[PDB]
Design an enzyme around this catalytic site. Structure first.
Site, mmCIF file in Angstrom:
data_model
loop_
_atom_site.group_PDB
_atom_site.id
_atom_site.type_symbol
_atom_site.label_atom_id
_atom_site.label_comp_id
_atom_site.label_asym_id
_atom_site.label_seq_id
_atom_site.Cartn_x
_atom_site.Cartn_y
_atom_site.Cartn_z
ATOM 1 C CB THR A 20 -0.891 0.013 1.229
ATOM 2 O OG1 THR A 20 -1.617 -1.219 1.315
ATOM 3 C CG2 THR A 20 -1.862 1.195 1.170
ATOM 4 N N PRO A 21 0.924 2.028 -1.067
ATOM 5 C CG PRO A 21 0.879 2.802 -3.262
ATOM 6 C CD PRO A 21 0.138 1.909 -2.307
ATOM 7 C CG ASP A 46 -6.039 0.380 3.967
ATOM 8 O OD1 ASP A 46 -6.993 0.809 4.633
ATOM 9 O OD2 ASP A 46 -5.258 -0.499 4.390
ATOM 10 C CD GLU A 63 -9.474 -10.273 3.972
ATOM 11 O OE1 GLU A 63 -9.895 -9.172 3.567
ATOM 12 O OE2 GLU A 63 -8.352 -10.432 4.480
#
Ligand SMILES: [Zn+2]
Length: 334
Positions: A98-99, A144, A204
């Site tokens: 994730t940048p 994200d 998830e």
């Protein structure tokens, strides 16, 4: 046993900041304690017995991000992760991260990713192709689930700009209890329409409407699929979307109660594409070789069946046809 370690392997779901050497994490914690930016005894205490259940593990990720969000560290851990994978005979790695933006240190999403590239250029113990062991490395940029549409679009824009240094796709990751699919769909559609490949953390937690919406988007891969229901499996199998299987991750976070009921066996027997992955081999104290050992034992695979499974991952990579042809040659040589 030992033949699994020398098996050529493909890793498709490994987070950069979840793949850090234990010793490296502690060295970074120690330096920041000597600076008094943290207290080494506390940070060590979370590192030692954070439950790493699904709820608990994201607090460990918060803590790791306090230790690692700095340009020099990003460069270091990128090199260390690639070399660690290559030394267990991973021959193709899609590394996802994730940048991050951090104004106080002059870090942008772009400069974070430039530090990743610098890490790839620093790789020295193995040979590397990112646009004596040899590893092919390509990059996924993670959006994200806390981000906005506008922020996600900046990440997609960056990915397009960095196709020349091996960015091949976009991921959606982070806390599955946070955010809405409607926020990310427009940015993921822009990415897909620009011929980036898409993988999604999917299922998830129980979320029937989001699972169906993600399947309807037709990503190129999904990760996990732990709380799929029958209509979800039917659609998944019909769309032929490969599943990134993260055995230890799923068991430790309690997304799957046991390897003996894990859906990877049903997918294998149904001849649905699956790829064994580490997710966070640092956080979860595993390796890709150990994930294969878990699967070989549980399914009862022969060496020949294991090699065939590993080789099948080639057509699920996001790499150019030239790279896939080289992988086929590498595998057919072993
Ligand atoms: Zn993941």
């Amino acid at each position: 046993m030992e033949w699994i370690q020398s098996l050529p392997k493909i890793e498709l779901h490994a987070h950069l900041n979840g793949s850090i050497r234990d010793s490296t994490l502690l060295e970074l914690a120690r330096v920041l304690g000597e600076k008094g930016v943290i207290v080494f005894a506390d940070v060590e205490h979370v590192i030692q017995k954070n439950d790493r259940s699904l709820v608990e593990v994201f607090k460990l990720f918060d803590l790791i991000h306090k230790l690692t969000t700095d340009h020099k560290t990003v460069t270091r851990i990128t090199r260390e992760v690639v070399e660690d994978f290559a030394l267990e005979n991973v021959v193709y790695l899609e590394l996802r991260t994730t940048p991050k933006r951090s104004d106080s240190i002059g870090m942008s999403k772009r400069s974070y990713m430039e530090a990743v590239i610098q890490g790839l250029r620093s790789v020295s113990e193995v040979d590397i192709d990112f646009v004596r062991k040899k590893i092919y490395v390509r990059l996924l940029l993670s959006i994200d689930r806390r981000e906005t549409t506008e922020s996600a679009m900046e990440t997609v824009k960056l990915a397009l700009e960095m196709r020349d240094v091996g960015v091949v796709g976009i991921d959606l990751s982070g806390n599955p209890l946070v955010g809405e699919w409607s926020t990310f769909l427009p940015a993921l559609q822009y990415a897909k329409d620009n011929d980036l490949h898409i993988t999604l953390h999917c299922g998830e937690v129980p979320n029937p409407k989001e699972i169906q919406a993600m399947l309807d988007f037709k990503p190129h891969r999904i990760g996990h699929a732990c709380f799929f229901k029958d209509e979800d499996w039917t659609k998944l199998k019909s769309f032929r979307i490969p599943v990134e299987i993260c055995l230890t991750s799923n068991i430790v976070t309690k997304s799957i109660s046991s390897i003996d009921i894990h859906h990877f066996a049903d997918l294998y027997n149904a001849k649905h594409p699956l790829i064994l992955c580490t997710d966070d081999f640092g956080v979860f104290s595993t390796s890709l070789s150990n994930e294969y050992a878990l699967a070989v034992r549980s399914l009862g695979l022969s060496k020949s069946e294991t090699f065939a499974l590993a080789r099948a991952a080639i057509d699920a990579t996001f790499a150019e046809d030239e790279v896939k042809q080289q992988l086929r040659f590498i595998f057919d040589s072993a």
